Write an enzyme that holds these catalytic residues in place. Structure first.
Site, mmCIF file in Angstrom:
data_model
loop_
_atom_site.group_PDB
_atom_site.id
_atom_site.type_symbol
_atom_site.label_atom_id
_atom_site.label_comp_id
_atom_site.label_asym_id
_atom_site.label_seq_id
_atom_site.Cartn_x
_atom_site.Cartn_y
_atom_site.Cartn_z
ATOM 1 N N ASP A 99 0.808 -1.226 0.000
ATOM 2 C CA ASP A 99 0.000 0.000 0.000
ATOM 3 C C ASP A 99 0.837 1.270 0.000
ATOM 4 O O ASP A 99 0.312 2.352 -0.292
ATOM 5 C CB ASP A 99 -0.920 0.059 1.223
ATOM 6 C CG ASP A 99 -2.029 -0.965 1.181
ATOM 7 O OD1 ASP A 99 -2.388 -1.426 0.068
ATOM 8 O OD2 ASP A 99 -2.542 -1.300 2.276
ATOM 9 N N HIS A 141 -2.275 8.031 9.122
ATOM 10 C CA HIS A 141 -1.928 6.635 9.406
ATOM 11 C C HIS A 141 -0.440 6.413 9.671
ATOM 12 O O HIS A 141 -0.070 5.363 10.213
ATOM 13 C CB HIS A 141 -2.320 5.728 8.239
ATOM 14 C CG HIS A 141 -3.794 5.645 7.996
ATOM 15 N ND1 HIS A 141 -4.710 5.456 9.011
ATOM 16 C CD2 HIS A 141 -4.509 5.721 6.850
ATOM 17 C CE1 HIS A 141 -5.928 5.421 8.500
ATOM 18 N NE2 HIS A 141 -5.835 5.577 7.190
ATOM 19 N N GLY A 149 -1.215 2.903 4.840
ATOM 20 C CA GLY A 149 -2.365 3.539 4.189
ATOM 21 C C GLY A 149 -2.021 4.715 3.297
ATOM 22 O O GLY A 149 -2.759 5.710 3.273
ATOM 23 N N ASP A 175 -12.277 11.478 8.945
ATOM 24 C CA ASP A 175 -12.034 10.545 7.845
ATOM 25 C C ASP A 175 -12.916 9.293 7.970
ATOM 26 O O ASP A 175 -13.357 8.917 9.054
ATOM 27 C CB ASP A 175 -10.546 10.164 7.853
ATOM 28 C CG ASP A 175 -10.065 9.557 6.553
ATOM 29 O OD1 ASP A 175 -10.275 8.339 6.362
ATOM 30 O OD2 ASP A 175 -9.442 10.276 5.742
ATOM 31 N N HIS A 177 -11.734 6.453 7.757
ATOM 32 C CA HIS A 177 -10.883 5.490 8.437
ATOM 33 C C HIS A 177 -10.478 5.974 9.825
ATOM 34 O O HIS A 177 -10.414 7.176 10.100
ATOM 35 C CB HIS A 177 -9.634 5.210 7.593
ATOM 36 C CG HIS A 177 -9.952 4.619 6.260
ATOM 37 N ND1 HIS A 177 -10.198 5.389 5.145
ATOM 38 C CD2 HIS A 177 -10.119 3.330 5.872
ATOM 39 C CE1 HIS A 177 -10.470 4.602 4.118
ATOM 40 N NE2 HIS A 177 -10.434 3.346 4.535
ATOM 41 N N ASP A 267 -13.501 10.757 2.292
ATOM 42 C CA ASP A 267 -13.917 9.449 1.814
ATOM 43 C C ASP A 267 -15.204 8.952 2.447
ATOM 44 O O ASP A 267 -15.611 7.821 2.148
ATOM 45 C CB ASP A 267 -12.821 8.401 2.024
ATOM 46 C CG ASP A 267 -11.971 8.641 3.259
ATOM 47 O OD1 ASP A 267 -12.282 9.489 4.130
ATOM 48 O OD2 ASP A 267 -10.966 7.927 3.337
HETATM 49 C C1 LIG Z 1 -5.371 0.104 1.635
HETATM 50 O O1 LIG Z 1 -6.239 1.033 1.377
HETATM 51 C C2 LIG Z 1 -6.494 2.251 2.000
HETATM 52 C C3 LIG Z 1 -5.780 2.697 3.098
HETATM 53 C C4 LIG Z 1 -6.078 3.933 3.630
HETATM 54 C C5 LIG Z 1 -7.081 4.749 3.071
HETATM 55 C C6 LIG Z 1 -7.521 6.068 3.600
HETATM 56 O O2 LIG Z 1 -8.316 6.791 3.038
HETATM 57 N N1 LIG Z 1 -6.927 6.606 4.920
HETATM 58 O O3 LIG Z 1 -7.631 7.224 5.701
HETATM 59 C C7 LIG Z 1 -7.806 4.306 1.964
HETATM 60 C C8 LIG Z 1 -7.517 3.027 1.440
HETATM 61 N N2 LIG Z 1 -8.345 2.482 0.405
HETATM 62 C C9 LIG Z 1 -8.066 2.772 -0.862
HETATM 63 O O4 LIG Z 1 -6.852 2.888 -1.348
HETATM 64 C C10 LIG Z 1 -9.108 2.487 -1.947
HETATM 65 C C11 LIG Z 1 -10.017 1.448 -1.652
HETATM 66 C C12 LIG Z 1 -11.011 1.100 -2.552
HETATM 67 C C13 LIG Z 1 -11.105 1.777 -3.748
HETATM 68 CL CL1 LIG Z 1 -12.351 1.336 -4.886
HETATM 69 C C14 LIG Z 1 -10.237 2.795 -4.075
HETATM 70 C C15 LIG Z 1 -9.252 3.143 -3.172
HETATM 71 CL CL2 LIG Z 1 -8.187 4.437 -3.592
HETATM 72 K K LIG Z 2 -11.818 9.215 11.296
HETATM 73 ZN ZN LIG Z 3 -9.552 7.438 4.700
#
Ligand SMILES: COc1ccc(C(=O)NO)cc1NC(=O)c1ccc(Cl)cc1Cl
Ligand SMILES: [K+]
Ligand SMILES: [Zn+2]
Ligand SMILES: [K+]
Length: 387
Positions: A99, A141, A149, A175, A177, A267
């Site tokens: 990632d 993160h 992340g 967020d 997440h 998001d």
């Molecule tokens: C491993 O994935 C992540 C880790 C951290 C964060 C985030 O937004 N941090 O707050 C977001 C993701 N997820 C994504 O990449 C992600 C997931 C699904 C789709 Cl369809 C597109 C994406 Cl860009």
């Molecule tokens: K949050």
């Molecule tokens: Zn996020």
């Protein structure tokens, strides 16, 4: 004044990563397209006197070895040869993989967000600005010695550290997440109260901010100082607003923070590819985000507003443009009139085919959580002798 972090070099670096592409350019050009820049005080990203001064700043949180490895990852990605097996093992030991891949500007890109959010904090500390916005920052993160992340350096932790070293800070993480890196950094610190609202479910990134069962909430003198509100998928503007509003107001009343730092990852929008929450950017002439920001700004506490996640770039620009307009309105008392139609500008075509400012969307456990959080806040006040 209301400050906003930007600059020509800063823009290029914020647009140099594979994951976030040109998002920051859409965001700032939409803010510019709506004629908001003259209302705003440009805050230049921080630059340093020497390599040693830069390393000293970044290793206030991150380990030197991790910073070294991140810089080496950039160097290695700027030459055409594959990584050696030894260098793959090195990068793996810092989770600089999967990632969090390398790319030719990975260190400069990561550092730029730190430069922007440190400068944002200084602008608040010296009272040049009552609120500073950094849509290039918000990378919650990243850990002391670990990328996570697509966060490589935790600009938020470094900004908060600068604030508390100038004092209590309330950190609010909107967020999708869990804001795990920031929570961890201040796990033992009662002067930085962290509050993350987020989706959590089995296997959903990053896994924390939920029952662990009981809720962990800090340790040492930091006990009860990490707050969390995990929510089930599908929540809309009103239910998310009602879920966090009383928490926010109670945290401000009890903690009386000297600064508020808000992570405003986009998001949660209904139109984000995650498709988890159903928040909007709607603003009746009501977005959960705009509800929360208006509430935070009504406290009249110096505030740092950061970005974060947001993977529908036009809809993230649509949201943060409205957040920026709302900040101007609340802080300066000056009406902002945003046309419902996207103005013509370089990225106009990315907002098609409808070209509206509104995103294209048609809109018991929480009471348990509120009781639990109120008790924790009572416990936090008792432990810290707050009134
Ligand atoms: C491993 O994935 C992540 C880790 C951290 C964060 C985030 O937004 N941090 O707050 C977001 C993701 N997820 C994504 O990449 C992600 C997931 C699904 C789709 Cl369809 C597109 C994406 Cl860009
Ligand atoms: K949050
Ligand atoms: Zn996020
Ligand atoms: K804390």
């Amino acid at each position: 004044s209301v400050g906003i972090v930007y600059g020509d070099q800063y823009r290029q670096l914020c647009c140099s990563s594979p994951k976030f592409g040109d998002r920051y350019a859409l965001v700032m050009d939409l803010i510019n397209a709506y004629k908001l820049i003259p209302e705003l005080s440009r805050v230049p990203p921080l630059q340093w006197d020497s390599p040693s001064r830069m390393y000293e700043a970044v290793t206030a949180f991150h380990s030197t070895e991790y910073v070294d490895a991140l810089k080496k990852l950039q160097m290695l990605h700027c030459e055409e040869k594959e990584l050696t097996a030894d260098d793959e093992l090195l990068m793996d030991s810092f989770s600089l993989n999967y990632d969090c891949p390398g790319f030719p500007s990975v260190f400069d890109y990561s550092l730029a967000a730190v430069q922007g959010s440190l400068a944002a904090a200084s602008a608040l500390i010296c009272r040049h600005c009552e609120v500073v916005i950094n849509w290039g920052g918000g990378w919650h993160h990243a850990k002391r010695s670990e990328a996570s992340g697509f966060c490589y350096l935790n600009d938020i932790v470094l900004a908060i550290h600068r604030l508390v070293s100038s004092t209590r800070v309330l950190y609010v993480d909107l967020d999708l997440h869990h804001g795990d890196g920031v929570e961890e950094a201040f796990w033992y610190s009662p002067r930085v109260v962290t509050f993350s609202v987020h989706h959590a479910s089995p296997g959903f990134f990053p896994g924390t901010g939920t029952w662990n069962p009981i809720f962990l909430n800090g340790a040492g003198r930091g006990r009860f100082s990490a707050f969390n509100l995990p929510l089930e998928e599908g929540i809309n503007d009103l239910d998310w607003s009602n879920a966090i509003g009383p928490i926010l107001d109670s945290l401000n009343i009890v903690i009386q923070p000297s600064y508020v730092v808000v992570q405003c990852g986009a998001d949660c929008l209904a139109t984000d590819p995650h498709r988890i929450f159903r928040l909007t950017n709607f603003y009746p002439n009501l977005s959960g985000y705009l509800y929360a920001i208006k509430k935070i700004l009504s406290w009249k506490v110096p505030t740092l507003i950061l970005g974060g996640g947001g993977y529908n770039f036009p809809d993230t620009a649509r949201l943060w443009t409205r957040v920026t307009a709302l900040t101007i309105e609340e802080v300066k008392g000056k009406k902002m009139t945003i046309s419902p139609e996207i103005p013509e500008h370089s990225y106009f075509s990315r907002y098609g085919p409808d070209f509206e400012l509104d995103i294209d969307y048609f809109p018991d456990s929480i009471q348990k959580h509120h009781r639990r959080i109120l008790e924790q806040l009572r416990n936090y006040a008792d432990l810290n002798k707050l009134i």
